[PDB]
Amino acid sequence: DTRPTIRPRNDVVHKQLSAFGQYVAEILPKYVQQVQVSCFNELEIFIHPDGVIPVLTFLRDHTNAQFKSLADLTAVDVPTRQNRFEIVYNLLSLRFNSQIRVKTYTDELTPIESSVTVYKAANWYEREIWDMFGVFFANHPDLRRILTGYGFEGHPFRKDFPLSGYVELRYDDEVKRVVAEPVELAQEFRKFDLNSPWEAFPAYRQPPE
């Protein structure tokens, strides 16, 4: 690189992924709403909520995809979107050493039928997406709590949920049992507003709205 400071880019993978992005797009014009290949050679397949089985089964068993490695499933709670939750699958191909990202919008009540049949790895990887966020997964073997406390109330990763939560424990000599009380902190979280009032990088700027 002539400029060693900035990270070199790989264009060869860029259109090759872009070619594969159109590829999967033409097979399913019913499901694939949006395909996007980012600057860092990462491809994203935006699908409809009821596409968890079809496209994943497509990516898992296709001759030209063979994406059978379920990397992770994550939600991105975005309050300003009418669909707050954004379930994100990550897929990995052993044969083509590439990565696949598919995202589905979902509301709180609207369920997502479980992808356990496609990948059995998602069995445990839904018990926390129901825990942290509260998105319910339909026709799933078990939705048990494995991160939150036994009988804990709420979905902590939701951004309407406080960092300190609501309940704090303490052993009580009156009852010989640790019990919960409303949280009161020794010191409150001194929040910092670090968003500079002067505009950042103009590339990703939103259009005049």
Partner 1 sequence: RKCDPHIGLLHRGTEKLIEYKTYLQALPYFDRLDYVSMMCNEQAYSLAVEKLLNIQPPPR
Partner 2 sequence: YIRPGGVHQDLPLGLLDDIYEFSKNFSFRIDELEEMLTNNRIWRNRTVDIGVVTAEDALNYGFSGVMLRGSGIQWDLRKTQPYDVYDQVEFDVPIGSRGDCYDRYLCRVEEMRQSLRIISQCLNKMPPGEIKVDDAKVSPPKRAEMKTSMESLIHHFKLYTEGYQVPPGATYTAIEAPKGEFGVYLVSDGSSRPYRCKIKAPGFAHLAGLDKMSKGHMLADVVAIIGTQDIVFGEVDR
Partner 3 sequence: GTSVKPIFSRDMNEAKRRVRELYRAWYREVPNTVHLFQLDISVKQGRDKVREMFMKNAHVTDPRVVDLLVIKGKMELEETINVWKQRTHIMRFFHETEAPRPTDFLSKFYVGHDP
Binding site for partner 1 (CB under 8 A): 1, 4-9, 39-40, 145-149, 156-157, 159, 163, 189, 191, 194
CA–CA gap between residue 97 and residue 179 (Å, rounded) = 51
Residue 69: strand pairing partners: 92
Nearer to partner 3, 12 or 178 (CB): 178
154 CB-near residues (< 8 Å, 6+ apart): 148, 161, 165, 166
Per CB under 8 A, the list member of 1, 11, 174, 184 interacting with partner 3 is: 174
3-class SS of residue 14: helix
Determine if 181 is a binding residue for partner 3 (CB under 8 A). Answer: yes
Determine if 125 is a binding residue for partner 2 (CB under 8 A). Answer: yes
Determine if 145 is a binding residue for partner 3 (CB under 8 A). Answer: yes
For residues 123 and 136, the answer to whether their CB atoms sit within 8 Å is no
> How many Cβ atoms sit within 10 Å of the Cβ of residue 7?
10
- For residue 70, the partner it binds in partner 2, partner 1, partner 3, none, with Cβ less than 5 to 8 A by kind, is partner 2
Enumerate residues 90-109 that contact partner 2 by CB under 8 A.
Answer: 90, 92, 94, 97, 99, 101
For 133, how many CA atoms within 13 A lie in the half-sphere containing its CB?
27
CA–CA gap between residue 135 and residue 114 (Å, rounded) = 11
Residues lying near partner 2 in the complex (CB under 8 A): 4-5, 38-40, 42, 44, 68-72, 74, 76-77, 88, 90, 92, 94, 97, 99, 101, 119-121, 123-125, 147, 192, 194-196, 200-201, 203-204
